[model samples]
Structures are given as structure tokens and as C-alpha cells.
Target: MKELIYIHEPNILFANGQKCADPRDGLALFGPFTKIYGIKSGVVGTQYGLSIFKNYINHIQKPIYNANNITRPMFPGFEAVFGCKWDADNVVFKEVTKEEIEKILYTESNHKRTYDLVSLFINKIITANKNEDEKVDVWFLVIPDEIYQYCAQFHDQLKARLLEHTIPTQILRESTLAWRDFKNKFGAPKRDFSKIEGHLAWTISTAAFYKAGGKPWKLSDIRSGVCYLGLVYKQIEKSSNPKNACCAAQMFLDNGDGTVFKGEVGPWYNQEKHEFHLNPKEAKALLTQALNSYKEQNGVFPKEIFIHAKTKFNGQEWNAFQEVTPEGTNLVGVTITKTKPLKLFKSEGNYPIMRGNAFIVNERSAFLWTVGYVPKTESTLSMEVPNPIFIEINKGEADIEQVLKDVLALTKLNYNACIYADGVPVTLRFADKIGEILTASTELKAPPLAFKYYI
Candidate 1:
């Protein structure tokens, strides 16, 4: 019921100033944006994975084909796509005993046990790297299928625990290493491992490279000096303190660098609305941390800071955010949340909707479809009609069009995995998971860490 304008899909910048419609295409043609001669990695797993892990990387080091027709781009090996050295020669293996694996998974109280396992791996890294001669930049920790099946929360617990350690980690399941062999794999059975093996290599290798502090391709045209913060809040569940919550800000810069800032915990959750609200003081503190981080990184304050959230900021909250802003910086609150059961279909067209299509309702608000039919794929990723998420400039002053464009471009910044487009911008896309990790940590205090570690 408004004016419709189609925003084109944003291109990704890869190595050597090359642009591509897809991640695989970009990596295949130009390699990652940040070139690394080689990645020194650590391996921690049961005996099942020591050999399996080696074989897994071996597989990732070769060309992976999609199908007989080669409809998708073949994933050149990790070394080829990343312009780095990634092989068993670069990996130092640490084998976890079978007895310990069983003791941790089968036990009813495995949360502590699994977390201790993480400590075991960390201790190994600390011991080996005591002199800094054999230290690894990242760890490739493998868990057995039993851990996946037995302890679903364990995954979150493990990841949450690792966040405190500061070393980037890539958790691998034995089933993933199983590939097409005797070991079964997930990601749907109909699409056999071989058919989508290249996709795995593309995504996993990309994440591994990034965890080793490598920068993959970045948003080709994100406006510089404008940072976005996706607010995170998860109510603590211990002893029935419903309103006690853990808060964090997932901060992404114009250059696609992201860091998570863990804020002070308090009674931010409101029972009446079942939503979290930060008091003026708490809100100010959060922005202060994020701003200081930006200043430290760029040696100056950002021109504008957009706070992306599903909930509209209350006057008090909004005021606090602005109060904390530096004299030269502007704090803008942009409400971005999914609409419920609302969608628009093309009056007539072969494609369902463009990925970047937007329908403006008024000067300050609109409905944007971040994911739909992709031109390169020539199809939508799902059978159901895609819904348009409602977006509005809830507070502050800026061009609505600029915010929309930024939101659309931000969707491509999900570097955790190589994908064409994610439904939500990177700012808000990982909010739920970020909250989970924030709340899952056993420690009372969590260190501010690189965004790569959380995802």
C-alpha cells in the first residue's frame, strides 16, 4: 500500500579489487580480501577425529564439485580460495581420550564436564605456547556425534565458555568429518554429502580463515565512519530472577569489522511487556564501551552511530544514548524487526521478489525484503513466500533512504559463513545467538571479544 523501489543486491569486495555476485565466485577468482601466507592452527579432539580431522582438511584442500552439471561454482581448495597455507603440516594435533569423551557425554551433569573439556583444550594451548614458539592462532576443536545428540546445550555451553579464552575456535563435529563415508552427516539427507560438499568447504574454510584473524571479503560500499550496534539482552534464569539479564552490544563498523561489548547486568527485563529496557545509566555505559572501541580502532569518533533493534527505544533510553555520544558523533535509533504474517507478492513476475526490494510507507518508515529470489540462483531459497520486515526510524534524524540502504547492505556482512544474503542485517541477525551465549556463560563476567568468536 505504498511506493515500491527495488534496491539492488550489494556486491562483495574480494582480493585484488574484484567484485562478484557470490562468495564462491569472489573467493575463486580473487581469493579473500586479507591475504595470509599460511594459518597456524591447533586441533583438539578424540582419537576418532585426529585422523578424521586430517582427512577433513585434506578434502577441503581439493576441488569440490556440486553435481554432474556443475550448476554451482566448484569450491577450490582452502589454500586456493584463501591465498594461504592450510594443511596438516600447519596443524598440531591434541588428542582427547575416548574415556573422557564418554564420561562427559553420557553423564547427566555434563555441562560442567563439557566446559571443563574446553578448559583442557585451552590449557593445552597455553602449555604449548608458553614460549610463543609453537602457539596457534586458532583452534579447530572436534566433538563426536554423541556430544551433539546427547547434549544440545553443550554446544552453546562450549562456545560460551570459549568466549572467555579469547582464542578463536572452530568447533567441528565428527559427523561433518564423516563426509560420504561410514560416518553419517546432517544438513538434510536428501542432499547427500557429496552434492553439497563444496558448500561445506566454502563456508567452513571461510570461517576457519576468519577465526585465524583473517578478513574475508567486505561490504563493497558500506559508508565509512558509521557504526551499527545490535543490542542484546538475555534474562538470567538462575533461581527465578526473571528480570536479571545479561546485556551486550554486537557492534559492526562500516568496514565490516565487528566486536561484542558485554555490558553490566541488572534488572533490565520487564515482566509487563516481556521485553528488556535499559535505564539511562546502563544505556550510556554500553554505548561508551562501543564508542571507545571504535575510537581505539580508527583513532577518532564515528560520524554517526545507528542502534538497530527490534524494540523501540524509550525516551529515557534514547536520551541516554544521545547523552553519551561525543560532541561530533550522532546517535540514531533505527527500529528493524520482522513483520508478522505480512508479505507482498508481485502483481505479475517470474521471480517472487528481489532480495533488496523496499516499499516505503512514509518518509521515515518502510517494509524491506532482505531475502527473496536471488538473480544468480534464479530461484528463491524457500518454498514459502518471503515476508517483508518492517523498518522505521524510531528516533534521531537521518535520511530514511540512507538507513534502508545501510540495512540492506548490512545483510551481506555476515562473515561467519559465506552466504549470498541473510534475512536480517548482521547487526540484528545474530541477536538471539548472542543473547544465548551471553546468558550461557557460567562466569559472572564475560570479556568483550571479537564478534568472530561468538558466532
Candidate 2:
């Protein structure tokens, strides 16, 4: 057994070569990695919700952090942080009718209701998209409290359906925009924000900026010409077969660009084993699509590609992966899953383990903690003990330690949040959500799109 090693939190590279751990600090200091010169967006929601969004996006909001009397930073208006002009009159706002929204919210069946709700948003977008002069880069669907609670699978359904439209969407909740107007159990008005106001502003504006085709920040130090894939298999309901399914995976590059590659479909699931496995030919074919997508982005094949799979890659599957890989390229199959058997406590206080503690079982396997007490955030806060993930290089040869470090870096590539890092790497973070969207409906089919469209 190797000694427990502590990994440092990776820094994010912002504009002008500035680096920082927290995105808020980086943006506040040096601005985003790439500040958006202008943003073209379309907003759709109830009249009340649309108005609330207008006020929230442009005005400065105060932060509340009652911990050790810490002075929380204010959420400067969106334009002040992201360097984008998103004033109250910036977006092409459209209001959905109350009669139409209630028609879907009160529906008894969730399956049909989800489709209808997404269709409404799509219809609004297409109708508004008629004028090329007013084409929008992203669409915002500000949701009312009633629809946010009543609608199930709305996120994935809209994501899959909007795929064909070739535009990203932002879903905003009404409760968030008009929080001060809301009432709690004691009848007092709800606070402006639950999280620190800066956090909300950072996250929301970052997502918006990203969806508008801008990079807020990327890994400060990741190897060049490397690609990672998070494999996904989901059982789908199709018209032809009784138990039809779909294959897809999220391909991620070190620069924080991820694409969803649709794979070959067949009867790959084994009932007796209760698991999914692809034949040699099927595995090679699916990866071909992923590699081609990567080439389209970079003009050449990546030096090495890693498959981050939840399930183990079988002998036939691993061989197929190797066979398709270009002669000079490296292929590695990795298994990332939860570690229930391995758990430890520190000899210290409330915040026990450091965020980047890793216990290498051997050269090929290790347990890495992606989440725990944040030394940068709270020194003595009594957050509960956290869990680490099981990482193993099941196939191929490569530096195991580098793989561990890369996983930690991958956790920071999640542009969906303005936080420092994610519990899981972008490759595996939204695996279930991507599968659900892919298999949400058999009728849903989308060409390869940027990861920004999904998360």
C-alpha cells in the first residue's frame, strides 16, 4: 500500500494569464477567460416571470453569509462580471400565454405533458427565429413556480428536443428571480437568494456566457492533445423492437469541449448477466464516430484517449478499442465508481480529509476524494465526512498518477457551475442525465452538438 498523498486543487486560467481557484475570484480579478463582446439571446416565459428575469439579470444583488460574520461579496450586475451587454432591453423577450402554460401543467400524464411543454418552447423559438437579422445565440426559458414544480423531465426533454434546433437554452425558475416577493411558512418574505448572492450571480452568468459561445475559463494546466470519453448505454423504447436501446457517450477534450456521440444500436444488453457489453465490431464503430468528432475540432487525432466507463470493459470490448485506435495513439480503459469499502477519518477536527487526498491501492488503482472539507472556503466548519471515488486503469498502459491528476482536473471543467470543482469529472458527472435525454424518446434524434447545449 502506498502512502496517502495530498493533491492540490487545480487552478483555472482566466484572462491575461491570471489564475485562481474560485471562478468568482478569477472573474472579479482578471475577468473571464474570454469576455463576450455581445450576447444575442431570446427570452420566453410568463409575463410575470419575464419581467422578474429582466430585473434580476441587470441589477446588483446583495449576498448574505452569516458565518463568523464574514462579509459576503455583492453580485455585481451580469454585464459587470461577464463583460457582456445583457441589460434589461438586451434580449428579445417573448411571453408565453398563461392559458397555454396551465394547459400542460395540469395534465394528468407526465409523459405526454413533458413533450407538449417542450414543444411550446420550441414553437416559440422557431416562430421568433423567422427573422435572420434577429437570430439568437441562446434561448432562455424562465419558468414559473407552478411549471417548475409540476413539470418532470422538462430539462432533458427540452435538451434533446432543442438539439435539432442547434441552439443552447437556459432554464430559469421564477422563485429565484423574485425571491424577495415569496413567503415562507412564517409568512415573512423569502430571502433574495438561498446561496450567497455572489455564487448565484457567478453560476447563472457563467452558464449564460458559456451557452452564448464564450469560454469563461479552462484548465490552467492540462496536457495537450488528450481526449476523454464517458460511455453511456440506455434502454430505449422504439417502434420496431420491444426492448430497443441506444448507445452514446460524452467526448471531452482538455480545453473543456465535450460532444455527445450517438453510437451503433443493437441488442447489446445481456439479460442473464444483467449488464451491457458491446461486440468488437460495435465498440470500434462507435469510437470511430467519437474520434472523428474530435478530429473535426482539432484537425488531428489526439495523442491519447481515455474511456471513463462506469462498467468494466470486457476482453472483446477492450480489443475492439485497441484495434480502432490509430497506430501512434494510446488507448486506455478506466473504471470510475463509488468506493463503499474504503473510508477513512482524520486525527484532526470537523473538516477531516483534504479535498485532494488520494490513496493509491497499487499502480493501476486508487481511491481519490473529489469532495470534502474545502480548506479555502471554511477552516473550522463542521461539514460531514465525504466519500471518495474508485479509479482503476483496467486496461492498457499509462501513467496511473497522471490519470489520477487528470481526473482531478476534469472535475474543474464543468462550465455549468461557477464553483471551483465538481464531485465527478465532466466525463462522468452527467452520465445519467445524458442517457436519460438520449433515451427520453425514440422520436428524438440530434446531430453532434457542443456540450454547452446539454449541461
Candidate 3:
């Protein structure tokens, strides 16, 4: 069964006036370039509901060594201290002048070099701080083994500082492996696969989105993922019954115009897609209309759309039916459990995020709830498009009743909904900072030791 989804192209990466080349190994790469769009997009949706940590490329206070080690304020453990010490030594400066080195020595004679390194690092940190509000989560680089051994030995130190931020870190690997797999398994020509395999994850979001449908599906996963889980939770919340009119809800498209033909209220999160429910006549009409629109646009559907929805759940008190609850009462937000397992890129090309049971219901507002935890849910709720309007529409943005039609179309993506592993989800990564990862690995309960391996 094919996924009724579509995906937007992931962001692209470029360096030295040219797109970077791949090694063809298919391993995950470090930094934002390698993170899949599904992960990046989903995180952004969650950021408004969570806290974020900003990361800078050159924000080193004491640039003692390579990407593995810089300078930071806190140290979590022996491993971190050891990593810092290692970074204090074997650093390979990519660009440093002799005069600058001499001035460094002339300035602080005692720890002149360390001071110089630290100084360089400090400047970058300042820059990073400016953008922290825009960043919600980070997937700090773990120094892939290929570069880890050769780059420097301060990874432990870098990892240590990351622990201080109380942010989660995803183990860094190379992305080349997946491309290579696509090449070999899918019979992509060798040269084509090699064209930008290293960079394709960012450049070809369509490949991932293709499973859902195609084009105009850029934000589909993020939108759909949340809704999918929301659908299930809403079902449970309405009644203890497992089977019911799957709660159908869509992010409200708050057009500046108050007209009903122009604005949409809310649609419960339905388990089925619009196409599945459309009768043959309705489906044919949509297809014909789509074909006519495509022809009018010279065969290319617009690449983007703009729509706004609830950025935060604090604005109202309506449950799923669009009915008003009591004052000071908000709709009950979805509930997700960490105890369940989640699987991505599984059946029918769907990215199945397992074990996360969520639902939408009547409550004070859209606040996450937990069984025994104080203050309940920790995730923050916010909107991606503040106005709730989708621009560059494919099916026709002006057709008001089709608001559900447009929304369902917007969410068709190649992947499934996603969930957080632990802690309270505070915010999500912003759209502009789409591919950037800001990892915050802490030391309190050391996460699983993740690393790269060679087969």
C-alpha cells in the first residue's frame, strides 16, 4: 500500500562555491545537511511548545582544537574533562596568521594560546546567542568516526559541554549511505547517484515526499504527522471506545478576511485522506480542475503555499466539534507516551511513529497532559503560518469549502507522524532554520552511547 503522502525537498548544502560531493558510503553526515526533512520539519512544529538551544558554526570562546573541541561554561563528567584536555592540545587551525599568533603571545603570556583559542570561540558564541530564540532543538555533531579520529580528540569535551544545555543530541553519522543504497537498490545510474549523493538529502526532498504524493508536499509531513497522532488521540478522548468517527481536525486557516468562504473554522483530524472519501464524481471534478490548473500554469504546479493555523492553543476553548467550552477551560491537548516504540520508513513507505498515543479533546486549552507529572504536558503549541493561509495553492486556495481539501492536500507526505523520546518538548525548529540541528546532550542520565560503525 502506497502512502497517501507527499514530501517537500530537504534543504540543500553548498560550500566553496560548489555543492559538496559525496563519498558514496551512504553514512549520515554531520550538521544540518544530513538530517532528514521529516525530522527537521517535525521539530519546527514542536519548538513553539518547547525550549530551544542555539548553536553557531564559529562560536568558539577558546578555539583550542577542531570541531570536536571548543570552549564552554560547564563540565559534566570525567569523560568531558578528558575531552577538554585533549582539545586544549592537538588543535589544527584552518586559518591563523603568524602576526596574530605573536600578538596572542604578547597579550596574555601565561595562557596566551588558550586565551587566543578561547577568544575566537567567545566571538562565535556571541553570534550564536543572537539566534537562540529561533532555535528549538539541536542534533550536535558526534564527529563521525571517519573524521573523529583525524579531526581531533576533543569530541568528549565537546560532548561534555553539550550535556550542560539539557538538550537532546542525535548521534551524528554520514548520509552518504542512504544515497548509495538508493543507487544500488533502486538501480539509479552510478553517475547520477554519484552526482550529489552526499548533498542529495538536502536537495531532493521529493524522493522522500514522493511516497506521500509529490510536490507542494514540503510541509506535509510536519502537518500530517501531528494530525495523524492527533487523530488517534482525539478518537480515544471523545469516548473510551476505540472505534468512532475518527476525530477530524485541521489547523484553522485564519484568513485576515472574516468571511466563511475565505476562512476555515476547524476540522477534526480524520484518519482517512480526502481522496479516500471523495466520490468518483467529486474525485473526477478535482482531477479535472487540477489538470486545468496545471495546464494554465504551463505544466508546473506552484511549489509553495501559505496558510496559518493556531500558533498557540491559548486563544480558545473549543473541543473537537467547534463548540465553545466554559471560560478559562481549554481543549485538552494530545497525550503521548514515551514507553511505546516508534518506527519510521516502514510499511507502504509510511514513516510509522509508534507507541505515541495522542488525542484532542475539551479542556482548558491545547496543553499537553501527563498522568502523574506536575503542570501536565511540557510541549509548547504554536503556528507555522501565523495567518493560517496557504499561498501558491495547487487545488485553488480561494475555494473556501475546500479548506479541508486544501489542508488534506497540504499534509500528504511520504513519512508518518513523529514523537519526542523524553523530557518535555518545548519548541520546534523554525522553517527558515529548517535543516539546522542544535543538539543539547546532558550528563544527568547519559543517553545511550551512540557511534558509527564500519561493516
Measured with C-alpha atoms, the lDDT of residue 170 in candidate 2 is: 87
Over 1-455, each residue of candidate 2 has an lDDT whose tens digit, in order, gives 54898888889888998888877667766778887777787888977887788777655433323223222334555666667786657588778999888887677897777778888988888788875568677788888766767773789888877777777888888876677778889876666465465556667777888898888888887788888988887765452653355677788876676888876666766656655678887788878888888888789998999999877778998889888899877999888987556767888764577778898889899899887766666532225576788899989998778888889988888778766577888888888888877776545557777777776
Per-residue lDDT over 339-409 for candidate 3, one digit per residue giving the tens place of the 0 to 100 score? 33322232452222221222222221111111111111222122111111211112112322222233333
lDDT of 1 at 400: 79
Q: What is the lDDT of residue 322 in candidate 1?
A: 88
Off by over 4 Å in 2: 61-74, 189-195, 237-244, 379-383
Clash number for candidate 2: 0
- Assess the local accuracy of residue 138 in candidate 3 as a C-alpha lDDT between 0 and 100: 30
Report lDDT per candidate: 0.77, 0.76, 0.23
Runs with alpha carbons beyond 4 Å of true place in candidate 1: 68-71, 116-119, 122-126, 129-132, 183-191, 347-351, 442-444
TM-score for each model = 0.93, 0.92, 0.21
Clashing pairs in 2: none
Candidate 2 Cα deviation (angstroms), residue 57? 1.4
